[PDB]
């Protein structure tokens, strides 16, 4: 058979009859308006289908058109700069086609439009008659100035080439490759369809070593993240959340940036959809938009709840598709707490047993099966490239408490936790990344790369963290006892800790010279702030009062190192060399 | 002896909801039977029969029902229960969660086929564990000493270094003054957790006897049920049928029971506390009580299962039910981990029930049973005193309780804190323990009688 009939609708669920050769978790199209559903139980000849849209006006006898596929994404050119929802309907194309301000709920508009033509080029030694396996880079499509959309083979099939396309412009419906297998030659276009719940196959997993240069100084030095890693941040109303998200898109070492807004809000989603197309990227040449390497999954709370459950899996599948080309993908999911509310709605719909505070039994399993899709990993194929997927997943716990069935399940899986604080945003301490509760499990991996590339860095981090923990312990006794009873070796730690909290940790994102400091500057300012701290140890154990008044120009040199403008690149290292020896003069005095 | 009738193949599925497939018109179905599902695209899935009623048989596939058709799928009934191929060359290799090789290797040649559920040991022919395992850690060997054949879990949480102290007690496991075959079940672990255990066993050269079973988080949750079952029926083979001392490490046991809750909630079974099934005590005890040693054999099996308690709660259904089956636990804490103690082992909720028979004159020496009770009592009083100086003041305490302050800062830094590769002997541990009792007077050591105070306290 090819159609089924409805035989009854009792809410979101449609128990469709005449469905004998249908599979589980397969997508159908219910009714005359073709409402998208999902087969969820299959009782012999009848299948019950939960429908993603509003079942209203559905008759008994309406055609249930089965697709034979599960919830899958269309992967191909036309995906950078596009805006989808959780089930991948192009929201920018659906407003031009219909000229309306709503989503008409009967719209099967394709995710990649078949009208735009793309310049395809073959793989140039991919001859006719050559054997090819799944994951091989088959062609290259110049989608933008930045993104070379490498057409690949799907990992399911395999064969020998019988026809390749000549280099030119083609649609996403044109036949580009024919492959001969034992039985029948298969042909397919530039677009491949892959299910969102199924992890992309890959050759072998690799440990992550290269760090993510986020650009912020507290993130790149104290609590570093690697490309191929898992990060979590608190998702509160205002601490630094949109600031860290836009700095990750603007000034990271990552080739594409996807952003999954997952069931967010009414007007917080429109803040993202208006500000991201007007951001700017600093390429070697002239300034370009950030939207040439960006793909958004925009999903509000008004949208279907089974699209908000699938918005996380839609994003990570787009993350794994651009991973397979050889790029370094970084994924920002905001937030994973609103996604877990969608799991509680689907489980509450099917009357599933509530395991932990309402949330179903498989909450910790779906979170484990999502963060494990991120990693630096060698892709399938013969050209032998390497890619990565980083995941920064926001967590929005109730009341800012970190004891929650979603929060505690997240912090047991993620390795980096940049703890953004509300009270630090009250004092305008920007960025608001707290350093007491934050951590990073990615130090050892990083420790390899920092002895091939920076060398004198690690011990610098260890003592700088030793200063900040000893500062908080000392600051308790300042109000109880007083600063006049404190020892001479301790009070020099307190002033340099205040020097770290203003020069190193505080970083103004609007002050031009501070938008994207690269690395040596980060090793630069800390090499002078702790050598000053180490030289002050023997200078005290040889008077703290005479050094504080006489170093007021030398301390002003340390308090002004953050103004090394980007017209000063090699010169900044020379000023870092000369400002150190001015400290070396005044040590003997 | 051997099943020689050809297996039947049914295309007669009648219902599929959740992980359960309902097959109709089966002729004489069998409980706990294993089956093989052939999908309409050709991928093969296995499954156990969890309920049979007349002609109907309810199976559950291990890899999930995503894509199982009604007209085109074909299930083939293997006529026996789930038996794994076990061998002596099932050692030195790494396997997945279900049954299959990982390191580009062959399938095992199957010296015999053992049922993975096993069968319980007769308590009349089960000899009590007596000899002590020296693990090289003072918090383990000194206060909560384990025996060879003892089940004892590591009670941990998320983020604490439980994997680091798991690899430490594997390198340093030895008899108190012919190696331990380690079988390792990795369940629901991260990739960096599985790479840590792989690169540690491939570092110390013990990988000629490691039986590592890895089951990552991307692998399905129903295969986590049979993962300790296969990891303990090879250890049963190596110890009761091949005469070899086996150390079994189960991690994570929280990932076992969270996977056990998903299958129970899908079968609509009766829940206990926090959604976990009512038969969770029985299912935890059918993989815990498969340990110890028997009378006619010279091999043994000891179990150290690692579990992370949710939200640091020892009254959660995971560490409470494993505390009722096992023989004492090891409690790695969080508040001692912030102070950069490498084993953050709070010894107050730690216990070893078989430690009494493993200490004494013939086992280590005379003062082991007495210094461990005194180090426990001075740590218990001094920690209650620590909750008094934080609420009243650091100066207005009893003069004896300032020695309890000086004991605790020397207990947590010198006795338990030893480093990732230092392996103290049991005689080194009691010698360090008497140094911390030296700061107390002779008549405040109440739990030690006056006889052995004369031989050890003046030194």
């Amino acid at each position: 058979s090819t159609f089924g009939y409805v035989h009854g609708v009792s809410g979101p669920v449609v128990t469709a009859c005449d469905m004998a050769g249908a599979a589980m978790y397969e997508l159908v199209r219910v009714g005359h308006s073709e409402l998208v559903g999902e087969i969820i139980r299959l009782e012999g000849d009848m299948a019950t289908i939960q429908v993603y849209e509003e079942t209203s006006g559905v008759s008994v006898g309406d055609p249930v058109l089965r697709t034979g596929k599960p919830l899958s994404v269309e992967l191909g050119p036309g995906i950078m700069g596009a805006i989808f929802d959780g089930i991948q309907r192009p929201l920018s194309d659906i407003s031009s086609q219909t000229q309306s301000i709503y989503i008409p709920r009967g719209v099967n508009v394709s995710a990649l439009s078949r009208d735009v033509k793309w310049d395809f080029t073959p793989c140039k030694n991919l001859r006719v008659g050559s054997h090819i396996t799944g994951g091989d880079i088959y062609g290259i499509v110049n989608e933008n100035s930045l993104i070379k959309h490498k057409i690949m083979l799907p990992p399911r099939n395999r064969g020998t080439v019988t026809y390749i396309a000549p280099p030119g412009n083609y649609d996403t419906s044109d036949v580009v490759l024919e492959l001969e297998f034992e039985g029948i030659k298969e042909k397919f276009s530039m677009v491949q369809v892959w299910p969102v719940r199924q992890v992309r196959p890959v050759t072998e997993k690799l440990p992550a070593n290269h760090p993510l240069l986020t650009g912020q100084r507290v993130l790149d030095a104290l609590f570093p993240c690697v490309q191929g890693g898992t990060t979590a941040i608190p998702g509160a109303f205002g601490c630094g959340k949109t600031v860290i998200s836009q700095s990750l898109s603007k000034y990271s070492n990552s080739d594409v940036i996807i952003y999954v807004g997952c069931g967010e809000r009414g007007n917080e989603m429109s803040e993202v959809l208006r500000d991201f197309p007007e951001l700017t990227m600093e390429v070697d040449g002239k300034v370009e938009s950030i939207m040439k390497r960006t793909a958004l999954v925009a999903n509000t709370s008004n949208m279907p709840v089974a699209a908000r459950e699938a918005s996380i899996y839609t994003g990570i599948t787009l993350s794994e598709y651009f991973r397979d080309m050889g790029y370094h993908v970084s994924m920002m999911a905001d937030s994973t707490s609103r996604w877990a509310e969608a799991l509680r709605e689907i489980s509450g719909r099917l009357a599933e047993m509530p395991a932990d505070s309402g949330y179903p039994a498989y909450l910790g399993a779906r979170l484990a099966s999502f963060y494990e899709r991120a990693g630096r990993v060698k892709c399938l194929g013969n050209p032998e490239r390497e890619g990565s997927v980083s995941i920064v997943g926001a967590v929005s716990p109730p009341g800012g408490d970190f004891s929650d069935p979603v929060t505690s399940a997240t912090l047991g899986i993620v390795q980096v936790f940049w703890g953004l604080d509300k009270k630090l945003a009250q004092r305008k301490h920007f960025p608001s990344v707290n350093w007491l509760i934050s951590y990073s499990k990615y130090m050892r991996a990083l420790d390899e790369y920092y002895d091939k590339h920076f060398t004198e860095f690690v011990p610098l981090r260890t003592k700088a963290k030793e200063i900040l923990q000893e500062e908080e312990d000392l600051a308790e006794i300042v109000q109880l006892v007083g600063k006049a009873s404190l020892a001479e070796t301790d009070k020099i730690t307190l002033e340099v800790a205040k020097l770290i909290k203003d020069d190193f940790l505080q970083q103004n994102g609007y002050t031009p010279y501070d938008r994207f400091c690269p690395f040596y500057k980060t090793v630069g300012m800390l090499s002078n702030m702790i050598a000053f701290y180490d030289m002050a140890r023997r200078a005290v154990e040889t008077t703290w009062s005479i050094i504080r008044e006489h170093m007021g120009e030398i301390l002003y040199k340390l308090s002004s190192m953050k103004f090394k403008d980007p017209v000063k690149d090699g010169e900044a290292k020379i000023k870092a060399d000369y400002a150190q020896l001015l400290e070396d003069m005044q040590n003997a005095f | 002896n051997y099943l020689s009738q050809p297996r039947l193949t049914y295309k007669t599925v009648s219902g599929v909801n959740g992980p359960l497939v309902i097959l109709d018109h089966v002729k004489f179905p069998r409980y706990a039977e294993i089956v093989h599902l052939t999908l309409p695209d050709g991928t093969k899935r296995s499954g156990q029969v969890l309920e049979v009623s007349g002609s109907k048989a309810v199976v559950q596939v291990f890899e999930g029902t995503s894509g199982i058709d009604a007209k085109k799928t074909s299930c083939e009934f293997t006529g026996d229960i789930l038996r794994t191929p076990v061998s002596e060359d099932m050692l030195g290799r790494v396997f997945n969660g279900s049954g299959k090789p990982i390191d580009r290797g062959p399938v095992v040649l199957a010296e015999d086929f053992l049922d993975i559920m096993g069968q319980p040991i007769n308590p009349q022919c089960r000899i009590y564990p007596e000899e002590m395992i020296q693990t090289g850690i003072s918090a383990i060997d000194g206060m909560n000493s384990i025996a060879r054949g003892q089940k004892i879990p590591i009670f941990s949480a998320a983020g604490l270094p439980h994997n680091e102290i798991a690899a430490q007690i594997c390198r340093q496991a030895g008899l108190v003054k012919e190696n331990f075959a380690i079988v390792f079940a990795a369940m629901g672990v991260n990739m960096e957790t599985a790479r840590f255990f792989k690169s540690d066993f491939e570092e110390n050269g013990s990988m000629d006897n490691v039986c590592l079973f890895l089951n990552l988080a991307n692998d399905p949750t129903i295969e986590r049920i049979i993962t300790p079952r296969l990891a303990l029926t090879t250890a049963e083979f190596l110890a009761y049928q091949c005469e070899k001392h086996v150390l079994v490490i189960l991690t994570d046991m929280s990932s076992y029971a969270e996977a056990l809750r998903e299958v129970s909630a899908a079968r609509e079974e009766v829940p206990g506390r926090r959604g976990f099934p009512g038969y969770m005590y029985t299912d935890l005890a059918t993989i815990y009580e498969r340990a110890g040693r028997v009378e006619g054999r010279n091999g043994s099996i000891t179990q150290i299962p690692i579990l992370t308690m949710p939200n640091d709660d020892i009254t959660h259904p995971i560490p409470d039910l494993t505390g009722y089956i096992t023989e004492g636990q090891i409690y790695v804490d969080r508040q001692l981990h912030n102070r950069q103690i490498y084993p953050p082992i709070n010894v107050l909720p730690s216990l070893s029930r078989l430690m009494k028979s493993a200490i004494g004159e013939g086992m280590t020496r005379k003062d082991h049973a007495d210094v461990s009770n005194q180090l426990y009592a001075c740590y218990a009083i001094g920690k209650d005193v620590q909750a008094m100086k934080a609420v009243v003041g650091e100066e207005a305490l009893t003069s004896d309780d300032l020695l309890y302050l000086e004991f605790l800062q020397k207990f947590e830094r010198n006795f338990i804190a030893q480093g990732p590769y230092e392996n103290r002997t049991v005689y080194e541990t009691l010698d360090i323990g008497w140094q911390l009792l030296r700061i107390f007077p002779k008549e405040m050591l109440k739990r030690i009688p006056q006889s052995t105070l004369s031989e050890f306290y003046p030194r």
Binding site: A351, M353, P354 | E268, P271
Partner: peptide
């Protein structure tokens, strides 16, 4: 929740035969 779902499961059993 377990008691009320068990009543609804038994209510479909009597409805199916009758």
């Amino acid at each position: 929740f377990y008691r009320l779902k068990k009543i609804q499961e038994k209510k479909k059993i009597l409805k199916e035969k009758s």
